[PDB]
Structure 1
Amino acid sequence: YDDIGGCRKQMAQIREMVELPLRHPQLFKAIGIKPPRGVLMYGPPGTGKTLMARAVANETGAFFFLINGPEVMSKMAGESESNLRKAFEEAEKNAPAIIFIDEIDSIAPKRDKTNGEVERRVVSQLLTLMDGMKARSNVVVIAATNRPNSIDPALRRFGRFDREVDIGIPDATGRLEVLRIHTKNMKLADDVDLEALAAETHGYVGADIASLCSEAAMQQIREKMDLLDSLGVTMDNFRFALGNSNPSALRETVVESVNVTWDDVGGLDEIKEELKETVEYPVLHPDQYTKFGLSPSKGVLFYGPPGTGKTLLAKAVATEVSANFISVKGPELLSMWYGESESNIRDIFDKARAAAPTVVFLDELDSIAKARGGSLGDAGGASDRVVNQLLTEMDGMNAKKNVFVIGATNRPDQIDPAILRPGRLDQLIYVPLPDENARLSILNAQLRKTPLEPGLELTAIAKATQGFSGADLLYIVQRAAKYAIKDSIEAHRQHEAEKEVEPEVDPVPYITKEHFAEAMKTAKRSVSDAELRRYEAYSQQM
């Protein structure tokens, strides 16, 4: 029982339910209420269902009977029903035992969309057997299903499997408890700070902590095997393992690693500070949230001219924020078949839930929630359904398990007015065209790792480029790099030819000022004046 951790309330409830009808039923008869027999367990996979059931079986010592879900069938004519009947008969006749059915969904699919007469038979036989619940038997049933919705509702009826226990994702304290429990047999170095590791394992749930520990041990073992009793996993080893791993549930939607720092995003200082405050304060000052009593905003929409850096800010948030992040592309959600689209949106938002904190970055929102003006004309006839599903799943998120969805569109005019309403996505950040100081900051942030000649005055370039967007600055820098590379290649070719018949190791060690001067002859503003006018008009209107 002590082995299972992080589930204090649920474990106490299960312990009471399993012990009171099994330890002393005299008090149960005295009070008169008969405690239930069937017990269901629900929650994400790996939360601790099987571990908890085995711990209850050991701590109690009652006789046990495991019914493997898919292992109830047989080859000979009519043996599954007899198998289940004899299992329950032996469980009752032997002692006040406990019967545990693993993966109940494998046996009790449903009574509607369920073909296979043999299956239906087995389902009805199990329903009847659980119906015949005699308290004198003193046997309780423990059910453990990772799919609580796709269960035959008849089994939920009173008299059989009546008490559910939603064993949900462990919290910070539960994560610390699990880390301490798992790290006790391992020889951890002195410098390890399990409290810090648990405060940092934001989205990890259950098995993920064990995975982190195992990975850290493996990394340390290789680190000292390549180079006996002097063996200990250090804090840097555990940090490396945590960085390598990702939360188990969100494994499928794991985005590829693109690096970006908060100093890489030149300019937009106040906007980045506000975004950091908005994303970190609700996650770091829960005492402040409780004292204020005001629900934090659960959405944000960046709008502005193209290339201003919306995707760059989103990448920076995904990299620097200490929470999970799932990127979504506009048309990516749409699907050919009927229903698949809304099913995929629901699956995405469900995955975003159960792993809080999370940050769903919806890029190019003009594809998911566009202004569905045309309705008389018949087409796909599903865009409205998708928009309604997104609205219901953005307005329906509970206050607990804060999941902030960041939207990003280039033309907000096509975004439907509905999604831009209070509650669903309130804050609207506008990313304007960079000013001279912002342009200098962007250029210095983009040329951080580029070796440059000592006498380069980027301030002149910034002062000259006045209506140029960040993409224009990137183009200028890339053109300068290309011209310098061409000059270096020509010099190296000449030197190689001469030696075959002379520059230094680097014929062009640094990008020449003349190189940038010639590169800037072919630069122009990316966004025109009509687009700038339309964006300014939208900003002032809203």
Structure 2
Amino acid sequence: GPEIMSKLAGESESNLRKAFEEAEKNAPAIIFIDELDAIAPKREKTHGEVERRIVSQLLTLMDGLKQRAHVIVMAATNRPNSIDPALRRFGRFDREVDIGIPDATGRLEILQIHTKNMKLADDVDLEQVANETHGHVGADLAALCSEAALQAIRKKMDLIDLEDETIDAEVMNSLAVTMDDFRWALSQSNPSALRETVVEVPQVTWEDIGGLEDVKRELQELVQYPVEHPDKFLKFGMTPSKGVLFYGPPGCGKTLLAKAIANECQAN
């Protein structure tokens, strides 16, 4: 992104032209634009003539895709409303994929990938750590493992101190990371990652709610049936309910019920 806006006015459009030109010749190819929001925020931040001309150059290049030439343009941004709506036109960036923060299962999956090279101890429970990372992205989990690795390092060869350009392998293979090292990393101020609206699958079943079998079967008729038996609703012709209201005294598991029913359907 900023690589293009760093080039002087004129050389900017040249690089964009050369980009598509070089990738089209090497077909099949994938053209990936990084910080697209820094290029085309044509709303209130489109203040000036230079900016608008740069955006249009890309727009022409997007339309300039002859289709028979097989290149696909991908891009990334912080939020949908950052990009210029002219790029949202069905014919350029027509397909959109929302990739929000990972959930509990997501963070667990990530941690194993970032710890695939390091020797994890027996007491280390990655599933536990993934559950208590309330609002963590992929990169923040990396820094979590890294700062915890440094904790495990400042206790081993640190006392020995081997000032060399090449560390011995036997020393590194014997090194291990404990659960307390992950505790220390979480205890610091570095897990302070951005917190958004969490969309996940509830890890709470019906067993956390005593009794109330009547509302269980009631809820299943409202959500389980129109997804597991959509043919039956079309058979009888009725239309599924769009919502339910829970009423009663506080602390009776209204929130727990709403989560539990989502758990039964395995939905978000």
TM score, norm. by length of structure 1? 0.34
Identify unmatched segments of 5+ residues in structure 1.
1-68, 251-281, 296-398, 400-421, 429-542
1:129 and 2:73 correspond: no
Letter in 2 for 1:285: V
1:143 and 2:75 aligned: yes
C-alpha distance in 1 between matches for 2:131 and 2:15? 48
RMSD: 3.1
Among 6, 21, 32, which residue is 1:89 paired with?
Answer: 21
**Counterpart code for 1:221:** I
The CA distance in 2 between the partners of 1:158 and 1:179, in whole Å, is: 37
Structure 1 outlier segments of 4+, above 3 Å? 73-77, 226-230, 286-295
2:12 paired with 1:80 = yes
Aligned with 2:178 (options 216, 234, 237): 234
Secondary structure at the counterpart of residue 80 of structure 2: coil
* Shift, 1:287, TM fit: 4.5
Maintained 8 Å contact 2:135/2:194: no
Q: Is contact 1:133–1:160 with CA below 8 Å preserved after alignment?
A: no
Q: Which of 246, 268, 276 in structure 1 is aligned with 2:191? A: 246
Q: Is the contact between residue 121 and residue 176 of structure 2 (CA under 8 Å) also seen in structure 1? A: yes
Quote how far apart the aligned CAs of 1:90 are: 2.0
> 1:91–1:97: 8 Å Cα contact kept in structure 2?
yes
Q: Does residue 1:204 correspond to 2:149, yes or no?
A: no
1:171, 1:75 → 2: CA distance?
A: 39
C-alpha separation in 1, matches of 2:150 and 2:6: 42
**Within 5 Å, which residues of 2 pair with 1:112-511?**
113-224=45-156, 225-226=158-159, 228-229=171-172, 230-244=174-188, 245-250=190-195, 285-287=204-206, 427=250
Equivalent AA in structure 1 for residue 184 of structure 2: F
Name 1:105's counterpart in structure 2. 37
Q: Within 2, Cα distance between the matches of 1:287 and 1:208? A: 33
Q: 1:200 is aligned with what amino acid?
A: E
- Name the structure 2 match of 1:519: none
Distance 2:9 2:109 in 1: 50
The answer on whether the counterparts of 1:133 and 1:159 sit within 8 Å (CA) in structure 2 is no
Residues in 1 aligned to 2:92 and 2:250: alpha-carbon distance in whole angstroms:
49
Helix, strand or coil: the match of 1:143?
A: strand
1: CA distance between counterparts of 2:74 and 2:177? 39
Q: Structure 2 length normalisation: TM-score?
A: 0.65
**C-alpha displacement of 1:207:** 1.6
Q: Quick one: percent identity of the two aligned structures?
A: 70
Q: Closer, same or farther in 2 for the Cα pair 1:288/1:123, shift >3 Å?
A: farther
Tell me if structure 1 keeps the 8 A contact 2:35–2:77.
yes
The CA deviation at 1:286 is: 4.3
Aligned length: 202
Cα distance in 2, alignment partners of residues 203 and 221 from structure 1: 27
How far apart in 1 are the matches of 2:9 and 2:194? 41
1:198-217: CA deviation from partner (whole Å, max 9, x where unpaired): 22323322122212211111
1:113, distance to aligned residue in structure 2 (A)? 4.7
